[PDB]
Structure 1
Amino acid sequence: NYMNYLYYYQNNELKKIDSSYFKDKYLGLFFGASWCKYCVTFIDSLNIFKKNFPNVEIIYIPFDRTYQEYQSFLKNTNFYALPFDNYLYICKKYQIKNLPSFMLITPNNNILVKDAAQLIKTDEYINNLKSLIKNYIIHPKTFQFNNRFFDLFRN
């Protein structure tokens, strides 16, 4: 069993969502931490991104020291998030240097834009990205129990 639930805040309650919800969706993997000053700044770029690409689900991959930092971060954003844990193995799989990082993922787990944090910080990208998404043709992929995250995060 791997990564059965993700989490979010709604109605002043911490809530869970079955990870099967994310099947067949484009994803934006946001690696960050509440203690990382540039990660907090990056939220402003992510919010512009989301309005222009509303079908992309933003997922917070956390590197907070404490659970209470994590809860604060989840509350102040409205993002979905992995459960609070140690995710350095995800950094290792994709050879992630620093925080913040932001990867765009297609519905079959293939990477659309690996270095998307630097792209969306140029603040002049919407037109190329829209044509990129238009021109990249996707072959769907099924996963057991409609859970894509073992393939995405583990070997």
Structure 2
Amino acid sequence: DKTAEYEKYANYMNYLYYYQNNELKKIDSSYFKDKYLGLFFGASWCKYCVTFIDSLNIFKKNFPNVEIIYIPFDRTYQEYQSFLKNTNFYALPFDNYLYICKKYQIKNLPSFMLITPNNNILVKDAAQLIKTDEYINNLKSLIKNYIIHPKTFQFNNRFFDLFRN
């Protein structure tokens, strides 16, 4: 039965999650339409993923417009919650996301990818980019100059196109 399947696709990733004063919260995925995204692949058991949070906090200070989304590879839901409570990032719901790794040929954790509003890759290896403080003005210029050609996504669902295509 196709309708059952395709309804799930149209409704794929309808919410992202975050913590706030130790309260699990959610936000409708439509908020992220037309926004630059920072996709952070990480896990609480990954030593340098935890240290990388310091670089991401500096990044967010300087690029508050770019929405950071945690793609989790935690071992347990309990670790996932603890990691979200400590970073206050948005996150995909706790689940298996190896398929996103395969699509983008992600080889190591942590990884950080910068995504344009029309789902193009602005910077593939942004984890390396942001590890010094020296990247800030060139990235302001790159974002300011980027010409966004409109794109229609399958089911008008931006995350389906980004993660499942």
Q: Please state which band the TM-score falls in when normalised by the shorter chain.
A: over 0.9
1:85 deviates by 0.4
Check 1:146–1:15 CA distance in 2 against 1; reply closer, same or farther (3 A cut): farther
3-state SS of the aligned residue for 1:30?
strand
- 1:148 is displaced (CA, Å) by 0.6
Deviation at 1:101, TM superposition (A): 0.2
CA offsets 1:108-136 (integer angstroms, 9 cap, x no match): 00011010000001321111111111221
Does the 8 Å CA contact 1:6/1:18 hold for their aligned counterparts?
yes
In terms of mean alpha carbon deviation, does 54-63 or 15-24 score higher? 15-24
When the two structures are superposed, what TM-score results if normalisation uses the length of structure 2? 0.90
5+ residue gaps, structure 2 = 1-10
Asked whether the equivalents of residues 154 and 160 of structure 2 are also in contact (C-alpha less than 8 Å), the reply is no
TM-score (norm 1): 0.95
Partner Cα distance (1:87, 1:53) in 2: 26
Map of 1:114 onto structure 2: 124
Identity over aligned residues, as a percent?
100
Alignment deviations for residues 72-115 of structure 1 (CA, whole Å, 9 cap, x no partner): 00000110000000100000000001000000000000011010
CA distance in 1, matches of 2:150, 2:93: 27
Taking the aligned partners of 1:144 and 1:97, their CA distance within structure 2 comes to 27
Could you say which structure has the higher helix fraction?
A: 2
1:48-81 Cα distance to aligned partner (Å, 9 max, x none): 0001001000000000000000000000011000
- The corresponding residue for 2:100 is 90
Q: Runs (4+) of structure 1 moved beyond 3 Å?
A: 142-146
How many equivalent pairs are there? 155
Q: Structure 1: which 5+ residue stretches go unaligned?
A: none
The CA deviation at 1:139 is 1.5
